[PDB]
Design a protein around this ligand. Sequence first.
Ligand code: NA
Ligand code: NA
Ligand code: NA
Ligand code: NA
Ligand code: NA
Ligand code: NA
Ligand code: NA
Ligand code: NA
Lengths: 471, 471, 470, 470
Amino acid sequence: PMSTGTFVVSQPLNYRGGARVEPADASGTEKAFEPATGRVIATFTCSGEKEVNLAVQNAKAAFKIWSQKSGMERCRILLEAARIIREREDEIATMECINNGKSIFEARLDIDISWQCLEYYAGLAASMAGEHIQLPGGSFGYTRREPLGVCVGIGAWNYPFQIASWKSAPALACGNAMVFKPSPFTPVSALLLAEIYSEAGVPPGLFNVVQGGAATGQFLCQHPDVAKVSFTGGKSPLIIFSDCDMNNAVKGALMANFLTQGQVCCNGTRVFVQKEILDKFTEEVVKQTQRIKIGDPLLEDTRMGPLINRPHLERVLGFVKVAKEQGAKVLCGGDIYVPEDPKLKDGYYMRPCVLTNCRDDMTCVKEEIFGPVMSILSFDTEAEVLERANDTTFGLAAGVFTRDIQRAHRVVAELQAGTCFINNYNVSPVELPFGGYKKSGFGRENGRVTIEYYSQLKTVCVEMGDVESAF
Amino acid sequence: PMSTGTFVVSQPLNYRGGARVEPADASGTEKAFEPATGRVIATFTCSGEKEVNLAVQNAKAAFKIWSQKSGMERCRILLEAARIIREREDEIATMECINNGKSIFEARLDIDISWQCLEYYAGLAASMAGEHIQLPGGSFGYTRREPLGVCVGIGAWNYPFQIASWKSAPALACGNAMVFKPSPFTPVSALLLAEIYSEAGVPPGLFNVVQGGAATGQFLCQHPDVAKVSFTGGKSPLIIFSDCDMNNAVKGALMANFLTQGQVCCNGTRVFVQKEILDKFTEEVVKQTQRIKIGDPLLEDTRMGPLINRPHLERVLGFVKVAKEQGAKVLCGGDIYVPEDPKLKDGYYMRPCVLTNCRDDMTCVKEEIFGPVMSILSFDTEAEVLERANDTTFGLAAGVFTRDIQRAHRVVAELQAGTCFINNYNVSPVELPFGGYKKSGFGRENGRVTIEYYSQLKTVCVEMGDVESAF
Amino acid sequence: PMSTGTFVVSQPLNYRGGARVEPADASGTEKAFEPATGRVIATFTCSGEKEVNLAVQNAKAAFKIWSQKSGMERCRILLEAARIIREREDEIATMECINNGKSIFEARLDIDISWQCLEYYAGLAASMAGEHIQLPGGSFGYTRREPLGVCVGIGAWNYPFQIASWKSAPALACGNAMVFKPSPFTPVSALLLAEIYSEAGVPPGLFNVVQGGAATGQFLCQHPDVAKVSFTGKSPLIIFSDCDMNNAVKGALMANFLTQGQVCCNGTRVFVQKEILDKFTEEVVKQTQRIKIGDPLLEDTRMGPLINRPHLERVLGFVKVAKEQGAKVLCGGDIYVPEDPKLKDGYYMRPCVLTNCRDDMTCVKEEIFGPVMSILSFDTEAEVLERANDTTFGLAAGVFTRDIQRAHRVVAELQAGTCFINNYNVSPVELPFGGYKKSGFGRENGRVTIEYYSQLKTVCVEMGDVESAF
Amino acid sequence: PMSTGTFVVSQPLNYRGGARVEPADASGTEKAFEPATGRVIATFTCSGEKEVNLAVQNAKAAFKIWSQKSGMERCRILLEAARIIREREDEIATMECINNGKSIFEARLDIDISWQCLEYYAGLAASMAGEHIQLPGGSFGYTRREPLGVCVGIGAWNYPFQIASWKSAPALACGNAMVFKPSPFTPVSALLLAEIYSEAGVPPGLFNVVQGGAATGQFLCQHPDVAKVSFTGKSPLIIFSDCDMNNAVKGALMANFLTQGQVCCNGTRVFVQKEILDKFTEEVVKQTQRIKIGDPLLEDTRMGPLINRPHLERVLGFVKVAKEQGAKVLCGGDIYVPEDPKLKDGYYMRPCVLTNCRDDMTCVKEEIFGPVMSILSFDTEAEVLERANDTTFGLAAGVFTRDIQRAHRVVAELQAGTCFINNYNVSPVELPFGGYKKSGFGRENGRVTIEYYSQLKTVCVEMGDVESAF
Ligand code: NA
Ligand code: NA
Ligand code: NA
Ligand code: NA
Ligand code: NA
Ligand code: NA
Ligand code: NA
Ligand code: NA
């Protein structure tokens, strides 16, 4: 029943002891917006030192209770929380859309990964085991993974609910308590998560939320009772050879640039296209790009909502202005989009941008824009691309499009990108294993590695026989 | 054939490109000693920036070759190096003793763990596997662990050859190159390892050694081509209840305090002893402590060699002086030990020390001495000890002596110590799993976790079908 | 709302294509009972060859659909079935009690393990991964675990619902279809499971149920389209004189009289050290005489009836032979007549405690499958380990002592696959860590049972050229 | 220094208590040959019941010592045996060649896998760990893998030293003892392994060797002290017209003519797409006719003789029946007489390539176990899949096409457990990732073979008090 241009936060945005609270202390005052309308949905207080201390002391007490619960008990509560998220999916997706501006289409996908994450770690909480080892004469050594205590999770504005689920689910599955600090741009959706954990049966204090910016974050990092803080060259390339399947390359290109309004570092923004198919690819992309439905994020047919805020939209438009000054040819977009609905008129919209005649020395090719901007760079040979494209960090992604798999695997072996795609490109958070595919699963390793980030190995040795003295 | 009071370094102490070299640049000049005699075994140059750059550039080139070798090929060379260490064990142990001062007894034990470590990781190099996952429509995702590049290992003086093996074996098993910086106190034994890797068949540059202190270490940390650097409340308690087996507790106590001349952080120095058995335990400990054979570390019967250096010896003798000022009762030792052999006259020896009438406010109970000093503190009940002993950090060890296992497991559950011992106490480096027991093995987790420290997960997705466009 | 002495099966007991069906052919006719009343709850037909063929052909078709579903999709449906079991727990526990006779207390515990099992394997279905390996020149090898096809589950009467969930959850999590054959003694509770899987969203045919005995079982084993069939001295308890008396007595009673002592794993041979023999024997008889025998649907009942009249007759026969052989019956070992007249024809007997037992006595040698405790006196640690170690690996053992060196020494010496120190849990063989409550399954158990219901498929991709030896 | 036409066994062929022995009992008398010459290298006695009993009793005693050794100690001994195999590689490869007939080229490859296998399991022996689990109130459960006891290895003639290593290395790494029964065709090379284990430091009895056939094998299976016995449409190759010709031809020859095509693994049914039939058939015949047939000890030999005269006669019989049934012999299928007169009575034949092959022909239906390639023409992807999906899981398949969508589609459709894309490796079933050179074993293969040679022991420690239901 919740629609665009109506929502106003009517409750406090901090969460401690199983209840929404006003911060005890201030480190600022921020405004959260509905990017679709440009309306202020909340004027909230940034948490000070005393408030951060209260949230950590509260989490410490909940940790002491929760860490004493068995794996199977923590699993039951996390599986209930996953069922509550699934039942309230649309309500959560709606609230995510209002504050962030992504399409209800993409918000539902984030909520799915959110409850999937919770079930995965709940499963791991229930099945965890340490090692048992035999020592001579009946003596034995055994290991167990223990939680750390109070963990802090830092939020980002591009995947608010998802980052919050993805940080808290493993931390909590381990036996830890979490103090979460959302991005001051997106304070709202993390409270839905806090409320849902409480409903599922987590002890009061286990998942706390303190709102704030840099000063709040610093108070959390510096807090002596905080065990751990979980934070959030060239840019991600997309290579399109002339032997590729045109339609799939065009579809991949648009998916790699214009999903989440292109406000992701995952995005395959540098689109290296082979000289022979340049013209055909460029024309088909512009054609498919001009068809992208820009509008109200709550509408089922919207595939492009607004940019997070007004300063962010101005920055993206600034990059387009500098691009054409530097010699780029704007094919479509890169300008303010005006919707027909007068309730969306002060909303932060723009037309998706496709740039041709791009060079490696251009700032639009060098810098990550965080907007719907595609840079098309022409290339001649496999050797040339790999030279221009291998200045990419491991933390980034890459995609290759070719029908010949020998070429594909050769290019994937050469590129320094941690996540590679062959004849596809998925835009998904870094933390997601197997490039964030739908019917993929998490595998086993990802959870093992993230479980050990939120825990410590305790070792016990039992001497059965007598002590062998060196003296 | 190598004996005490004769060895002098006659070759350069840096190692690059499969050969011993003089540093190209200086950041100081250090003296390495034979602690048994107080003789200077080497006057060496500390590596400067240009020298660190040469060693890293050389490691970079070796990395490029080695990382391209298969797991099975890296395994063959690491198993051959383990065979060479095992064949040259006594020569290595002797050279370790001359520079460090530990007994040939303890040096052999370190060399054993060293070649055991190399076999373990060689086995893991050969059997490594990533994950394969099925995606809908014949599509698939897969992972692989790749090396980082040039890894740096920082050495310590207490386990010179052991720390160099333990850091390099996993790093190299992964496909990395290592630049190793030994402690300026112990430069010599790491060159034996460098030489052995070369003999085994590692490419020139794969295991480099640069000598130096803090400035050398800083140059290594700051080097832009260095992928990763591997570094190194109350103190480790030992609880002795009155229901324990006396002889085993006394043996454990002496092992926990006087092995490696008590120059280890993991040593169980705070010895909480229950009021009823205090007198009998104290007397038996002093009796067994006064029997400890102090002398030339090359002698098979020596169980106590000299302290690393004269400044270190002076510091320990200073702690004993402050302890008796604060109210401690010295039972035995804590003074200069003079050997009968005139070649050991200027060596850094002291008698193992046993202190009674100790309190929790005394600096000898609060501070880590790094010498053979045992603090005996009387206690009344299980509740009292656990209060006085739970100011211990996770990174530390603990030991409990009692015949009742319910008490033992209760105390082990309550203590914050990462490594716990029941009716025993092993003094072993932190990195060692299952408290560094002899016929223990490393299990599976330890290697998995250490591999993951020296590598990164590369993910590849292959789209078999068509791209599903949201637009 | 379901109570004792009222239930009658009013629907067919076979299940195929998402519906209860009458078998297409016969291999017999069995009677299922309510052991608390002795009433016939069902007269059912044992499945013949044609019926077994129909159930397998149906499972084959469902397998083809289900095996094509992703891990995550199979997980969703198995987690829903676990939620349905949990919501209907009391209804399932009640129906289990009526047909089997165990206490509502113990039935709830079995149902808990049943939905816990489903969640575990659902989790593993979602997170399964094969291995990826690099070969020279960009070439690579990879593995995947594939289902087998039509798997058969064979049921037992002592844990009807538990066995059905325990065999079907992993088989189904793998991508297989199952044809389940319950024990002809307990046909009823497996249909609740069949119905629940259907409700959860399994395709019709994925979990079929054919009723029958040995002939039905043989038809299933011999069926050419069946990929795999998953089938269904004695366990000692050593009580040293340095043990904690109350804990040993509690452990003894738990190890003998739970599930009416009808489990094979039960610690029936109770070796007790000579010094505490008398005190231990007296305290045990005292606690045993206090065991609440009655209607299993009652919350305070800890002992219901024995499964059958021929089964009850057999246990009573062992007691008769025991006292003939020289045993001294302290309490029980005779027909129990409850207060409630609706329980008058129920298969009830008082729990038995036997003293003055010897190793040559048939009650100490043979497995009774009733509430019978044999107390054997012993002198030393060396003696027990001689008399007691003639136990096979598939059995359990328990040791009671305050000294852990003795405990671990005894546990190291005994050939028993599952050992207990200062406790004794009575739980199915298949349950890891001796079937403890807040234990979990660990990781290995599931990996091993996943392996039983699947096969490793290997694929090698050559990137470069073929290296010819010729 | 060892050459063809000279070797004679001069010692007994049984091995017990760290020494070569004559069997105490007889179940037959077999002759072992040098297939390259037709010479008798040994006339040996097949072990009877009493001899099998002695070897098992001896293994039982060694088991008791070895099982008590730590993982690290068993690892040391197995790493020393791998080093001894590696140092004596050529001597072992030579002795393997003399008795079996494979090329020194292929024998070295088998010896490599043999010492690689030993190192792998030695590594696993050193790093083994069970599970540790927390239970409420400080209580805990733990697991450990224990050896079984006396394990029996059954040998095959096609990979003598390899099978002996592959069965013994894991069995021994677990803490077991092994009684090994080689194929009566190849008794010799397993004694080199027995002798090498002894030299490495295994206790006398740990690796015993009893020679014999079926009656010996039956005595081993029936022996009450034996814990476990480890025993030993056809594999298609699909060549589409969009494949790389040279790689397909190379793959075809590798898949048919390695190990004289005497493996069950071999991709003998060669389905070739109608457009490339003629070009492929002619290129195959060309490369087949240039395969170097001769003395297996020569470095350039790629084809030796067949294991024995009866096997050679069987293969020649298949060729005779093939041309009767309508096949067109392009090359081979007949007695080969080498240039060397010492190879005169050797079991040689020229490698065979058959065209005009139909599905109803016995050469396409039956496994030949000789160098015989059947070329069957096909029209479409749908046709091959129907004609080729009659292949069991235990078999292999290979597909040659430049389009990977087709390749993965065909690999998904085929029931073969091991599939190859644009390659075909001929390697023993037990080998993971299709037996590639710089592959490694991965982790799962060893975990699964460890489980086969061991049993899980579970121990529960109650820290608190016993929770009584009564
Ligand atoms: Na609100
Ligand atoms: Na609310
Ligand atoms: Na961000
Ligand atoms: Na020197
Ligand atoms: Na080792
Ligand atoms: Na050092
Ligand atoms: Na030298
Ligand atoms: Na070097």
